[PDB]
Write a protein that binds this DNA or RNA. Structure first.
Ligand SMILES: [Mg+2]
Ligand code: NA
Length: 1217
RNA sequence: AAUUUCUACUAAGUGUAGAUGGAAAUUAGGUGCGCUUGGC
DNA sequence: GCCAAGCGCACCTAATTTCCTAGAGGACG
DNA sequence: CGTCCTCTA
């Protein structure tokens, strides 16, 4: 047997199957005539309106409770939370207080007399109408009288808000786990950074943010946290931290802005405050003012013309500022000024090419007077900060004879105005009144471009003009220039609101209608499938050969299908007969202790007292003999209950064997499910569809086409297995199915069409049939061009698991006794999205390859898809759409499509090699920092892999085989959340990443040297700590013999004594100032360096000779070369041809490991590149953990640490060879 | 260039291969642009 | 040119909760 | 009392 074989039927999970519902016969005509779809579409709109009106009540209920609550456990909790030496029993007391703090909040809600009525019909029928004051709102609510069952789920979503448990949707969790934690962390930050703020800044926040009713420091003491339970107080507190924007546009500074300013001034790095999260269900209104935007295309065009045409206001000032700057030479150069900040940087780049030239030229003139060098540049930075403004006459001093600044300014303002004119010539037709759009502005890229190119050039002109304001408050100021300048600039500034508002409109996703749910006038439509509820739900399933049907009875003919006989003679549909006894532990007492039943039988006071007391449950009041008789009472009653005794041919165990009541309940639950089919006359049923008393839909996907011939979708297999005699409860059909209408979203005639009898190009370059010619047209996106019904069907897998064990423990036992267990190591990155290495139980590489491309073979045809290229494309189309105001397209479907190929290949590897999976213990935190590279796939890869391994099916297998659809493998624990995962998830192990890639696989050598240059004396010490440094004539290499015991914090190394060589090349990454690269030849570079300084490098050991240098540049250049030598991973940014791994150390045969010597080979014994090396050593770090399982008794496997330490790893990697 | 839906296809002619947990609710994040005040 | 703190708008992405029910019971003509 | 919607565990 294998290890996989042990992991079937371990736990339950639910899934949904989705199908198209094709109306059959006169079904559609009858639905058209009764106007059912228009009623359902209006209902969904009204339903969202009532949901919004309920939230208005719910929120008022919440705030009245939260505004009045004083947390009792609070000060004890904060005190203990801030303790830094906590005993393990103090940590336990902290959890107890956290829990009790959430119980205070939950009981405050749930202790209200009205709480229960908030989630029954009372809230719609009575409570909400009395709360409301608007005749039309009240009438919207009243329209759901008799339909409140439709809110049962929404009432569960609202009930979740009032839980006491540490659950993400709970109010208490938001208050105590999240916001109280940030409030307390912020208190500590306040006590550190307190003194940075001066009286004026703290008084400003008090006045403009705190309504002069509080001091800023109040919100950093524990007793004020109650103020911050409601959104109103969260806004105030977050304004303290972040400030707000006034009606005038002024940005008032919060504490975090002041902290930043101080940090940027003192070059320090003080910590910043965290803002609190929003209160659940609050309707947020910002404390900052933001002007009113636009609401219609017509309005965007009227504003664009009124404000930007030729004879418009904003234009005429561009015309003014132009002629103004074209006459600079009537105003004193001494009185016009460029304020010392971004203005002087801007002007520097536009006059001297680079932002820093003006400061540089000023620094040189400072040096000329004032000539300790870190003192200096600090004073000289200060002395230069004290200058507020530079006049144009002063800036002329910096020009070089060929250059005059004023004339250079002129051509700049000419350059930009010519750019403005140019764009108007492309905006001729837009400014005409006779023009009106052929397309809407959220879907008319050509018109948006003409506007955006216009708006851009005006902003470009405006930012250049803004540099000429100066500080303003300078005396010498030429008010014959500023007078007209200030007037034409303050009008141009009006473009800021227009630019902002036009982008805010024009980049809006256009409206797309959602599908909507169908009820067929029944508030509990299709609620379940039980035969005894057909009349209440009015939906059933029929089968005619291989085709399946949904059958719906009209509200006025609920019985119309039960009475149908069989047509012994002609044809018959098969009508489903489904029986379910759900949740026997609750159902059985509710039915047999009911008035409708306690009339029939009478439970003895013996039977009555025991359920009244609670002596049935395992707990603090147990008694096995009571549940024994209780079980026999239930068993006795099941016989007398007709609609159960005949539905499930029960086969209970001998009563004396149950240990608690849940032992009886599990047999009732498992046996309380039966699905069969009864016959029904096809002619009689079809007539019902004709007459309109029955609606019929084929449950359809393409696997049910008459033309289908390939392997079905896995979901088709699940669906058909629902009704297969070999399915003995492994997959159950559940209630809760739903039916929707998705209106067409594309016009048929607007679709891309490959017309019949014209050859279509095949796109797969490995496909030798280059063309396909069909006798019928084929349309792009055909399915969205017709209205479609869709049916969603929930199923339950392994509802009654028999293999209950701790899955993690079982894997460890199995690995312990496996004499040769395989490992799939998976390195996750961005140069290679995913890299796979499979090892055997001795660490021999069995398979290795990147998954940037997916290789598939079918029908002899090979196909290769470069998903790394596709995602890179999509990522760049999205980056451009954002900057151009064009459509931002989805990437997550492409990711999902890519990841599904990956997951499929990993499942084949798992099955082929019976292998566990090794991954890097990537903390949540590294993963969010790489989310900016939208190609990123780390977490989506994890979610889909874990999901598939919750129920893993080779869909080619026999369905009754282990690993077929009825006996799926369950080798990860049931996905509840990431939050709750450990470093083992069944067959998946997460191990420490440290030096899995930057390590020589052939020796175990790693770079543990600190080679950043710091000073001459440190460089001399570093050099002298080598045992020898010499040139080796016979190899043309420099040798650097070292004992790691002579260097700082090298303890993890095992071998200690290494000989490094200047062997081969490296790629030096650096910025000139963005990331560039150059190849370096090490030996040749060392010779260049030593020659530059007259160093006779042939002179045997040269450690002492190198320490005779006095130039800092020598030691600095020498340390850089050492870093390059110790840099084993080398790559070009965005390049497939360079990502090699090269070792500066020889192995036992005198060979340097060079991954490129393995890149060539098709079957390689060592990794083929650095990413393969990463995956290899990730797998080996799990081999190590397996080695720990084997050193341990079985009873203790659960407590074996799987995280190899850094010291253990180097030892392991340096003794494996 | 067809789909319950998605990705890649045309796969032998209305389709092929793999994947696919829906619904509702809550909440958070990332990118991009503008504005405020600042730092190389 | 790059970057920080903060406010705003637009977009897409995604984490974590809950249900996946038949039969008693009530309202009502 | 028959039917339809609500509620419960
Ligand atoms: Mg198929
Ligand atoms: Na942002």
């Amino acid at each position: 047997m294998s290890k996989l074989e042990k992991f079937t039927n371990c736990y339950s999970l639910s899934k949904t199957l989705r199908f198209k519902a094709i109306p059959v016969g006169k079904t559609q005509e009858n639905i058209d005539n009764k106007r059912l779809l228009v009623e359902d579409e209006k209902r969904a709109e009204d339903y969202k309106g009532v949901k919004k009106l309920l939230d208005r009540y719910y929120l008022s209920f919440i705030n009245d409770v939260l505004h009045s609550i004083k947390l009792k456990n609070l000060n004890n909790y904060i005190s203990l939370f801030r303790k830094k030496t906590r005993t393990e029993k103090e940590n336990k007391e902290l959890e107890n207080l956290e829990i009790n703090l959430r119980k205070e909040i939950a009981k405050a809600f749930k202790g209200n007399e009205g709480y229960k009525s908030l989630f029954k019909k009372d809230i719609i029928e009575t409570i909400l109408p009395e709360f409301l004051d608007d005749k039309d709102e009240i009438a919207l609510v009243n329209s759901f009288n008799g339909f409140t069952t439709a809110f049962t789920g929404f009432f569960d979503n609202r009930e979740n808000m009032f839980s006491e448990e540490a659950k993400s949707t709970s109010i208490a969790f938001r208050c105590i786990n999240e916001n109280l934690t940030r409030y307390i962390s912020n208190m500590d930050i306040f006590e550190k950074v307190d003194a940075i703020f001066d009286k004026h800044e703290v008084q400003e926040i008090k006045e403009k943010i705190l309504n002069s009713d509080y001091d800023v420091e109040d919100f950093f003491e524990g007793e004020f946290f109650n103020f911050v339970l409601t959104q109103e107080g969260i806004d105030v507190y977050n304004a303290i931290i972040g400030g707000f924007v006034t009606e005038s546009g002024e940005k008032i500074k919060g504490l975090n802005e002041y902290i930043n300013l101080y940090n940027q001034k003192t070059k320090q790095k003080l910590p910043k405050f965290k803002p609190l999260y929003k209160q659940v269900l609050s309707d947020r209104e910002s404390l900052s003012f933001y002007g009113e935007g636009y609401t219609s295309d017509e309005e965007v065009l009227e504003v664009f013309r009124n404000t930007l045409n030729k004879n418009s206001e904003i234009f005429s000032s561009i015309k003014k500022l132009e002629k103004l700057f074209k006459n600079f030479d009537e105003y004193s150069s001494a009185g016009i000024f460029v304020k010392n900040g971004p203005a002087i940087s801007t002007i520097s780049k536009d006059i001297f090419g680079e932002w820093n030239v003006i400061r540089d030229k000023w620094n040189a003139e400072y040096d000329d007077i004032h000539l300790v060098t870190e003192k200096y540049e600090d004073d000289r930075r200060k002395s230069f900060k004290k200058i507020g403004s530079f006049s144009l006459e002063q800036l002329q001093e910096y020009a070089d004879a060929d250059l005059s600044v004023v004339e250079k300014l002129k051509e700049i303002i000419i350059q930009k105005v010519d750019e403005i004119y140019k764009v108007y010539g492309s905006s001729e037709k837009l400014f005409d009144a006779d023009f009106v759009l052929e397309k809407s502005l959220k879907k008319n890229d050509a018109v948006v471009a003409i506007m955006k190119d216009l708006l851009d050039s005006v902003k470009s002109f405006e930012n250049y003009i803004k540099a000429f304001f100066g500080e303003g408050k300078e005396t010498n100021r030429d008010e014959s220039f500023y007078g007209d300048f200030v007037l034409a600039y303050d009008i141009l500034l009006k473009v800021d609101h227009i630019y902002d508002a036009i982008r805010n409109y024009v980049t809006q996703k256009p409206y797309s209608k959602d599908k909507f749910k169908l009820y067929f006038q029944n508030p509990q439509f299709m609620g379940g499938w039980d035969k005894d509820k057909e009349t209440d739900y009015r939906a059933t399933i029929l089968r005619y050969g291989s085709k399946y049907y949904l059958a719906i009875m009209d509200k006025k003919y609920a019985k119309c299908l039960q009475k149908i006989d069989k047509d012994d003679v002609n044809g018959n549909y098969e009508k489903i007969n489904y029986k379910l006894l759900p949740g026997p532990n609750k159902m059985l007492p509710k039915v047999f202790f009911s008035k409708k039943w306690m009339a029939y039988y009478n439970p003895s006071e013996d039977i009555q007292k025991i359920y009244k007391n609670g002596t049935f449950k395992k707990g603090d009041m147990f008694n096995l003999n009571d549940c024994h008789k209780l079980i026999d009472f239930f068993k006795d009653s099941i016989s007398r209950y007709p609609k159960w005794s005949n539905a499930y041919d029960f086969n209970f165990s001998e009563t004396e064997k149950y240990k608690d009541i849940a032992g009886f309940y599990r047999e009732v639950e498992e046996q309380g499910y039966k699905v069969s089919f009864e016959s029904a006359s096809k002619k009689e049923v079809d007539k019902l569809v004709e007459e309109g008393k029955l609606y019929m839909f084929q449950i359809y996907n393409k696997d049910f086409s008459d033309k289908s011939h390939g392997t079905p979708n896995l979901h088709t297999m699940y669906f058909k297995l629902l009704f297969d005699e070999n399915n003995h409860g492994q997959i159950r059909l559940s209630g809760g199915a739903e039916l929707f209408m998705r209106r067409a979203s594309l016009k048929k005639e607007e679709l891309v069409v490959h017309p019949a009898n014209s050859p279509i190009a095949n796109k797969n370059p490995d496909n030798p049939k280059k063309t396909t010619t069909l006798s019928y047209d084929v349309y792009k996106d055909k399915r969205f061009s017709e209205d479609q019904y869709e049916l969603h069907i929930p199923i339950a897998i392994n509802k009654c698991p028999k293999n209950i064990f701790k899955i993690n423990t079982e894997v460890r036992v199995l690995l312990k006794h496996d004499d040769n267990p395989y490992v799939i190591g998976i390195d996750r990155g961005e140069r290679n999205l995913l890299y796979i290495v499979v090892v055997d139980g001795k660490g021999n590489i069995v398979e290795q390859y990147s998954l940037n491309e997916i290789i598939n073979n079918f029908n002899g045809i090979r196909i290769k898809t470069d998903y790394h290229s596709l995602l890179d494309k999509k990522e760049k189309e999205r980056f451009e759409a954002r900057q151009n105001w064009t459509s931002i397209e989805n990437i997550k479907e492409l990711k999902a499509g890519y990841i599904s190929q990956v997951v499929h290949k990993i499942c084949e590897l798992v099955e082929k090699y019976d292998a566990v999976i090794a991954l890097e213990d990537l903390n949540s935190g590294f993963k969010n920092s790489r989310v900016k590279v939208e190609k990123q796939v780390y977490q989506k890869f994890e979610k889909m892999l874990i999901d598939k391994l919750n129920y893993m099916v080779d869909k080619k297998s026999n369905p009754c085989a282990t690993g077929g659809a009825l006996k799926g493998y369950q080798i990860t624990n049931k996905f509840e959340s990431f939050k709750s995962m450990s470093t083992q998830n069944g067959f998946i192990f997460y191990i420490p990443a440290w030096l899995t890639s930057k390590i020589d696989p052939s020796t175990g050598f790693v770079n543990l040297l600190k080679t950043k240059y710091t000073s001459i004396a440190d460089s001399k010490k570093f050099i002298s700590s080598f045992d020898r440094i010499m040139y080796v004539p016979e190899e043309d290499l420099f040798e650097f013999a070292l004992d790691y015991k002579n260097f700082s914090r090298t303890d993890a190394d095992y071998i200690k004594k290494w000989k490094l060589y200047s062997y081969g090349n490296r790629i030096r990454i650096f910025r000139n100032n963005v990331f560039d690269w150059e190849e370096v030849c090490l030996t040749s570079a060392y010779k260049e360096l030593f020659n530059k300084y007259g160093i006779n490098y042939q002179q045997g050991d040269i450690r002492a000779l190198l320490c005779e240098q006095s130039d800092k540049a020598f030691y600095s250049s020498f340390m850089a070369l050492m870093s390059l030598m110790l840099q084993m991973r080398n790559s070009i940014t965005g390049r497939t041809d360079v990502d090699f791994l090269i070792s500066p150390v020889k192995n036992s045969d005198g060979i340097f490991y060079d991954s490129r010597n393995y890149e060539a080979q098709e079957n390689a014994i060592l990794p083929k590149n650095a990413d393969a090396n990463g995956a290899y050593n990730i797998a080996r770090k799990v081999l190590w953990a397996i080695g720990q399982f084997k050193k341990a008794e079985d009873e203790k496997l659960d407590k074996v640490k799987i995280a190899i330490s850094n010291k253990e790893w180097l030892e392991y990697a340096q003794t494996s060879v």
